[PDB]
Amino acid sequence: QLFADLSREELTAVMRFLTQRLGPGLVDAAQARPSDNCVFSVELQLPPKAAALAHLDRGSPPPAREALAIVFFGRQPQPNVSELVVGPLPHPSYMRDVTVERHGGPLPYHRRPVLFQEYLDIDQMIFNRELPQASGLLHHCCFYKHRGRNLVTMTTAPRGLQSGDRATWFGLYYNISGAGFFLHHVGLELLVNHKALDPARWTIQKVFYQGRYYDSLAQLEAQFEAGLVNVVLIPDNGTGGSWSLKSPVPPGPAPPLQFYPQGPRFSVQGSRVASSLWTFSFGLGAFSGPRIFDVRFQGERLVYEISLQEALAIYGGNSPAAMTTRYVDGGFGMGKYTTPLTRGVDCPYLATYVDWHFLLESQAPKTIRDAFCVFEQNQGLPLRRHHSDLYSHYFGGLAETVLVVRSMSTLLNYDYVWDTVFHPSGAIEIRFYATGYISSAFLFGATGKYGNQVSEHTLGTVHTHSAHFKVDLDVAGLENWVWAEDMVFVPMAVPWSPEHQLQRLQVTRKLLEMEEQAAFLVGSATPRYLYLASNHSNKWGHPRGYRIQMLSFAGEPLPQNSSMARGFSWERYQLAVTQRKEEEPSSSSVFNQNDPWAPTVDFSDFINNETIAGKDLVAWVTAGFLHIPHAEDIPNTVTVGNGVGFFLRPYNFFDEDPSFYSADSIYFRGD
Amino acid sequence: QLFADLSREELTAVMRFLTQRLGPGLVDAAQARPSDNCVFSVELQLPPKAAALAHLDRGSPPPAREALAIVFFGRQPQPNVSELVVGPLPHPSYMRDVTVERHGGPLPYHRRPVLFQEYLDIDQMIFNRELPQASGLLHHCCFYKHRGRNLVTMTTAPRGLQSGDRATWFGLYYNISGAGFFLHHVGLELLVNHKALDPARWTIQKVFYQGRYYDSLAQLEAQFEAGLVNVVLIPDNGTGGSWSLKSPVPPGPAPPLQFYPQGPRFSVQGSRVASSLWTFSFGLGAFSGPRIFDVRFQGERLVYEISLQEALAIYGGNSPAAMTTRYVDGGFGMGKYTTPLTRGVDCPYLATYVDWHFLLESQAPKTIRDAFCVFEQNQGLPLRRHHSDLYSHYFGGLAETVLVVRSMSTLLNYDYVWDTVFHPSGAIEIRFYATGYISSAFLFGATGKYGNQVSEHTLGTVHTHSAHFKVDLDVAGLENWVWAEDMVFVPMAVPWSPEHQLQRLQVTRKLLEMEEQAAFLVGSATPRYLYLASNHSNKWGHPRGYRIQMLSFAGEPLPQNSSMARGFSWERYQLAVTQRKEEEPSSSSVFNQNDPWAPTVDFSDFINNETIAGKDLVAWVTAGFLHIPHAEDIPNTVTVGNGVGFFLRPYNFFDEDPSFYSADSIYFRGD
Numbered sequence A, B: 001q002l003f004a005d006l007s008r009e010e011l012t013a014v015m016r017f018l019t020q021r022l023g024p025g026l027v028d029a030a031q032a033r034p035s036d037n038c039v040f041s042v043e044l045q046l047p048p049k050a051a052a053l054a055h056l057d058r059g060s061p062p063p064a065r066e067a068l069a070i071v072f073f074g075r076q077p078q079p080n081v082s083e084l085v086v087g088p089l090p091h092p093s094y095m096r097d098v099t100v101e102r103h104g105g106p107l108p109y110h111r112r113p114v115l116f117q118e119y120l121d122i123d124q125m126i127f128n129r130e131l132p133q134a135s136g137l138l139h140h141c142c143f144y145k146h147r148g149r150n151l152v153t154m155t156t157a158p159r160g161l162q163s164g165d166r167a168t169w170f171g172l173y174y175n176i177s178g179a180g181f182f183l184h185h186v187g188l189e190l191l192v193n194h195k196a197l198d199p200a201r202w203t204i205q206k207v208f209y210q211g212r213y214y215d216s217l218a219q220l221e222a223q224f225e226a227g228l229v230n231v232v233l234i235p236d237n238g239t240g241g242s243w244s245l246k247s248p249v250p251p252g253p254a255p256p257l258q259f260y261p262q263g264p265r266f267s268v269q270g271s272r273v274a275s276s277l278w279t280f281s282f283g284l285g286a287f288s289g290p291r292i293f294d295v296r297f298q299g300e301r302l303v304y305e306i307s308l309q310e311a312l313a314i315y316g317g318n319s320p321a322a323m324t325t326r327y328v329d330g331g332f333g334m335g336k337y338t339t340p341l342t343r344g345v346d347c348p349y350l351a352t353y354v355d356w357h358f359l360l361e362s363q364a365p366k367t368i369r370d371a372f373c374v375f376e377q378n379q380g381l382p383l384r385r386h387h388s389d390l391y392s393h394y395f396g397g398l399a400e401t402v403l404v405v406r407s408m409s410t411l412l413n414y415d416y417v418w419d420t421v422f423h424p425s426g427a428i429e430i431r432f433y434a435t436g437y438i439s440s441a442f443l444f445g446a447t448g449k450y451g452n453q454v455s456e457h458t459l460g461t462v463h464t465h466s467a468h469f470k471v472d473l474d475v476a477g478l479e480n481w482v483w484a485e486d487m488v489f490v491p492m493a494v495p496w497s498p499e500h501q502l503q504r505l506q507v508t509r510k511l512l513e514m515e516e517q518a519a520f521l522v523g524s525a526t527p528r529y530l531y532l533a534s535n536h537s538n539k540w541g542h543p544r545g546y547r548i549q550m551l552s553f554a555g556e557p558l559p560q561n562s563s564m565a566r567g568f569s570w571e572r573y574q575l576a577v578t579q580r581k582e583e584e585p586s587s588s589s590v591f592n593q594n595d596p597w598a599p600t601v602d603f604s605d606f607i608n609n610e611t612i613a614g615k616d617l618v619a620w621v622t623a624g625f626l627h628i629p630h631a632e633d634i635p636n637t638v639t640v641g642n643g644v645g646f647f648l649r650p651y652n653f654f655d656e657d658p659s660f661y662s663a664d665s666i667y668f669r670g671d
């Protein structure tokens, strides 16, 4: 496996190599401060596609196993963060900054994501130096006690208002046991200015309490005991979903159970899963998230790569937090926040479960058990089917059984469900669901344009979800073209009665040659049939292609007049196809999160006058939808209807529905 | 069971009663001749909602169990086809001609569907009068031995060009045995003007053979014998999916499958199903198709009824038949063409199968085994789910299990799979797929405007699929309103830093008061969050409602300039909402198919400027798509991602996610 995420051991060797080259002033990033030199991350560095392919096809010698490590360099006059490529594994030797090379110049230190350590200091400063200045108020409303931390904080992004900032707003919640605190915002949000390399110089720029702005906790505290701050008492406990996840009702009859009568018909051999029809390797980007490479259907490779690129979530709000939150989850990392899968709930009780080794903000490799799960799910629905009683009685059909590869990313409040379905029809399905806990704020004022009240004093904040996927199809090879077929009604006379009129239905086919005419903004209509296809024809003389069908209800992307709108330019499209370049492996950056104003990676820069006619193309799909919270989002948001994504379906790629050749396919005559 | 379909006894009772009060001139519609009198169909006349609800949930006396019977009166000077509502079953007493009452006016005979007899009468005219006149041509091109009729014809629709017609176009295909004959067009189509009441009077107005139009079979045979008809010999046999339906590859490791560990959590008695969560009555309209009534989630009725209302398939092509086919399949009968379900393919093995009785084109009611299938399906995906590793390490999930009611209709070539899935969240999903075989034509000329080549000498005719559903919700009462909520970005300077700009995300909440406001034309933007609500609010003061999330890519509906458009005016809408009037019980009629030029039930008329505020409403959803046949549709077209419909989701209808109380919910802490 050329695409097997770095191994438990491999990570160890890269780290041992680094401790040695980066000098000893290097500290474990698990407890480093702005001024320390620490290794933020180390994971698989993807091999170039050319060499990658040569190895898989000619048999040529595979490229070198490299790893990308991000190191924060605070131990220096002009601190920076840099991308260094290490290798070749398993026994490293070289190492080389690529930062400037990849991003034109030095990566500004303020863009670096917030370290685990860095968060504590913020609570440190909050629960210790700050919150006390308003204990009076707190002793009242929120049961603050002379003991501490019966409350917790929650970050938001981006940090600030213009490029170069690191000012984060933190809501305060009740530290609820065994259930989401997200639903119990105490009403207080603080704008922490944590830009200084010295935690001693961090400050509170502004405070927002139950409706109004205060310059400091003190001033607020002051006004509270002064008698001018009316407080709405927030209960610290209760019953129902708003309070617990444990269902009050005792079990009944066991829910239908899925099982393989003769055992699993697939085989996860490391990162590569192999079944009767499909074969592929899988993984998880520490930041990008789930990814699959070299997808071969019955031997033939359709896709070189289908990877998650980014996740956005723009909030509308009542308070300052909600109001400015525009999370760019990859800034946190979908791989990193991948929660272990619960056998029986997250995946069928008899699914295969795989582990995930990572080296992020730490110096020794850790593992997430059951990060992924691969299994076969009998849909209950038939793939194909036809009952004939006319002229010749017979029946032929096939009940559909699919192959799923799942993984879940729990970024703070909600959990993402990354589903990759492999159909017997040679069709590939990609879906993602947003479930778990929604982000709520304190309810005050007319609940009109920011959400609905889902529970007392708690407001479901409106927001949009949007994910981006890289779909590096290599339909029947590397050089593919984009075709756009649709329909139309041509009025014309009836050949056998020119006295009458008919609306002749015809197909409308167009070739997309320029990246632009193949980039479709969110909102505008798209061709009913859109697909990338080969230069070569399938038996009946048609270019063998694979169609791209989407399932998006995507909200409107932040207006362009927004200076951060560039931090996630991909959201403005439903789809775009470009010349898959080696210098365009990602559509977003982990750095884009903390500084969307000055994108480390701007996706719109992938679309320029270029021919997407006979080149190595890559499609970019954006799926998403508007989420106006409501009662039934308590406790968790369900997955029903909320699962968006897209399809990769063959169109004249095969000379016939291969499922014809299904072992499991059924046939008989009459009854 | 006041919604339950009529059974043998009842149908018999009505028939017995009909042949009695109808008198002497009443032949068995099975053989009945054009100028005969016969009972075309005896079905259940749906009860007036008012009294239905009056009794159902109060105690009032149940309404008169009725049955609507349709008779073709041909044996008379002024032939009409009439709708008669028969007396109180089980022992019928009265009879009323509702034709004028109901449709207002008399039903022109030429609107009557073509009886299974007329079809025979036709084949006789073809084979035993016309086909021999081209014995020479056929004996060559088509292995045509006048012996055994190795060819079969296939009706199209509508019949005629202007209203008042009955001139069908029949293509001729090989009588393949045990497979689809649709993939084998012999290039010969015919225009049988079976308008007259006397079968001898019928004639072929035009003939079409492998490209050219001719005036008579004789004229063709003549030119063939003359030498001016270069025939392309269509192979009558061969292998692959185009000939077989039975997979060649033997059975391999068995596919996974479910099973209820402690038996099924749902019971089926008659037409009513009930589980811990759901309660409802199902059934099947003869032409209307699948329908469901009195849906109660834990006792609360959400919908009075949700039924299919019509199906349509508008075609394009180079061949006359194809070139003008606009199937309003309800003119055929989705109930009527419901084929038997194959246990383990069409539905899981461990499902509950149901029969269906009917008195159609016969004098004796017959039954269809396993017409319906009800079961429970562990989806193998989670409903709600959160894994906590931040602050408090708890986990709460619930893999989703759904309840399904299915039925499959086989209208000649394709089989429609009708779904309706009730989810543990109180969301009702309606999906329908199109599978089975396509409709092919003879290949020739510049191919590209009408379809792709899917096999030797056969084209995959471009077409559109659409289906209309009557969703008559009753959100906690009959008075429901229509809300259209949706986003918008409002720029305003950053409260705490005016120098900086901000894009304030907000929600728009507009109320639809007129039917015109609520009717949404296909291809036009619709409010993201659109739903019907009650007057009454939930514990958090928001209106109690259900939103209608749509799932369709409806291809452009037939223009309006076209003479027939009105026959299926609903196809021009994605959604529309109206006042549940008892006289607007259906969006289409069985009689519309043969007279699209003079619709028996014009749907555009259901949309007049009436207030849809605080009334009993009903939504009309339209879901469909464009189908451009491709190789992978051979042997059959697969369901994968071709299932369109919609969801009925609870929106502030509950005080929370009702699944929090799932007995099957899961919770715990740590691993």
Ligand SMILES: *[C@H]1O[C@H](CO[C@H]2O[C@@H](C)[C@@H](O)[C@@H](O)[C@@H]2O)[C@@H](O[C@@H]2O[C@H](CO)[C@@H](O[C@@H]3O[C@H](CO)[C@@H](O)[C@H](O[C@H]4O[C@H](CO)[C@@H](O)[C@H](O)[C@@H]4O)[C@@H]3O)[C@H](O)[C@H]2NC(C)=O)[C@H](O)[C@H]1NC(C)=O
Pocket (backbone or CB within 6 Å): A535, A536, A537, A614
């Ligand atoms: C689809 O196309 C590929 C590649 O064809 C490419 O052709 C070039 C010119 C670009 O337009 C690119 O966009 C196309 O994809 C097919 O495989 C190759 O097909 C090309 C023809 O298009 C073959 O190239 C020719 O090769 C001969 C000698 O082998 C050359 O002499 C030709 O060029 C001469 O003339 C021009 C103009 O005077 C000069 O500029 C040149 O210097 C030469 O003097 C020409 O390039 C090529 O041989 C094919 N591949 C091989 C080596 O087997 C592919 O088969 C096709 N698929 C189908 C079925 O449609």
Ligand SMILES: *[C@@H]1O[C@H](CO)[C@@H](O[C@@H]2O[C@H](CO)[C@@H](O[C@@H]3O[C@H](CO)[C@@H](O)[C@H](O)[C@@H]3O)[C@H](O)[C@H]2NC(C)=O)[C@H](O)[C@H]1NC(C)=O
Pocket (backbone or CB within 6 Å): A021, A022, A073, A076, A079, A080, A081, A082, A097, A099, A100, A105, A106, A107
């Ligand atoms: C981000 O900061 C790192 C700091 O590690 C920068 O890399 C450093 O680059 C300097 C300049 O080449 C290296 O300095 C050394 O200076 C001595 C003094 O004579 C010379 O003899 C050595 O040959 C060497 O050049 C330093 O070793 C190197 N450190 C590492 C581990 O990379 C880096 O340039 C900054 N990134 C960007 C994008 O500017």
Ligand SMILES: *[C@@H]1O[C@H](CO)[C@@H](O[C@@H]2O[C@H](CO)[C@@H](O)[C@H](O)[C@H]2NC(C)=O)[C@H](O)[C@H]1NC(C)=O
Pocket (backbone or CB within 6 Å): B073, B080, B081, B082, B097, B099, B105, B106, B107
């Ligand atoms: C269709 O024909 C029927 C024939 O039964 C007409 O109704 C009957 O008409 C006869 C005399 O023609 C009366 O004696 C019966 O009492 C009528 N009852 C029935 C059976 O309907 C009917 O008027 C005609 N309707 C249309 C469509 O014009």
Ligand SMILES: *[C@@H]1O[C@H](CO[C@H]2O[C@@H](C)[C@@H](O)[C@@H](O)[C@@H]2O)[C@@H](O)[C@H](O)[C@H]1NC(C)=O
Pocket (backbone or CB within 6 Å): B479, B535, B536, B537, B613, B614, B615
């Ligand atoms: C909700 O409406 C009920 C019936 O609607 C009519 O009755 C009055 C509200 C009147 O204003 C008409 O215009 C309405 O269309 C009504 O009887 C209930 O009292 C109403 N309940 C609530 C919660 O307002």
Ligand SMILES: *[C@@H]1O[C@H](CO)[C@@H](O)[C@H](O)[C@H]1NC(C)=O
Pocket (backbone or CB within 6 Å): A148, A149, A150, A151, A152, A153, A175, A176, A177, B391, B392
């Ligand atoms: C939150 O409280 C729980 C117990 O209620 C404790 O285990 C956890 O460490 C606390 N964390 C914070 C942020 O106070």
Ligand SMILES: *[C@@H]1O[C@H](CO)[C@@H](O)[C@H](O)[C@H]1NC(C)=O
Pocket (backbone or CB within 6 Å): A177, A237, A238
């Ligand atoms: C919340 O209330 C319940 C019942 O009223 C009580 O049992 C529980 O201890 C409370 N929550 C906690 C753990 O403090």
Ligand SMILES: *[C@@H]1O[C@H](CO)[C@@H](O)[C@H](O)[C@H]1NC(C)=O
Pocket (backbone or CB within 6 Å): A516, A609
């Ligand atoms: C695209 O590039 C061409 C040059 O090849 C130029 O003529 C044209 O104006 C450009 N169109 C755009 C995207 O403005």
Ligand SMILES: *[C@@H]1O[C@H](CO)[C@@H](O)[C@H](O)[C@H]1NC(C)=O
Pocket (backbone or CB within 6 Å): A391, A392, B148, B149, B150, B151, B152, B175, B176, B177
């Ligand atoms: C087709 O062949 C079957 C085989 O038994 C025969 O019963 C049927 O009559 C034939 N249909 C035709 C050509 O009408």
Ligand SMILES: *[C@@H]1O[C@H](CO)[C@@H](O)[C@H](O)[C@H]1NC(C)=O
Pocket (backbone or CB within 6 Å): B177, B237, B238
């Ligand atoms: C087609 O040929 C096969 C021999 O391979 C034969 O079994 C079959 O009967 C022929 N077609 C039919 C069913 O008439």
Ligand SMILES: [Ca+2]
Pocket (backbone or CB within 6 Å): A515, A578, A579, A605, A606, A607, A608, A610
């Ligand atoms: Ca480009």
Ligand SMILES: [Ca+2]
Pocket (backbone or CB within 6 Å): A472, A473, A474, A475, A478, A480, A580, A616, A617, A618
């Ligand atoms: Ca490619």
Ligand SMILES: [Ca+2]
Pocket (backbone or CB within 6 Å): B515, B578, B579, B606, B607, B608, B610
């Ligand atoms: Ca109306």
Ligand SMILES: [Ca+2]
Pocket (backbone or CB within 6 Å): B472, B473, B474, B475, B478, B480, B580, B616, B617, B618
């Ligand atoms: Ca209603």
Ligand SMILES: [Cl-]
Pocket (backbone or CB within 6 Å): A501, A502, A503, A504, B562
């Ligand atoms: Cl037309």
Ligand SMILES: [Cl-]
Pocket (backbone or CB within 6 Å): A558, A562, A564, B501, B502, B503, B504
């Ligand atoms: Cl903004």
Ligand SMILES: [Cu+2]
Pocket (backbone or CB within 6 Å): A001, A062
């Ligand atoms: Cu290898």
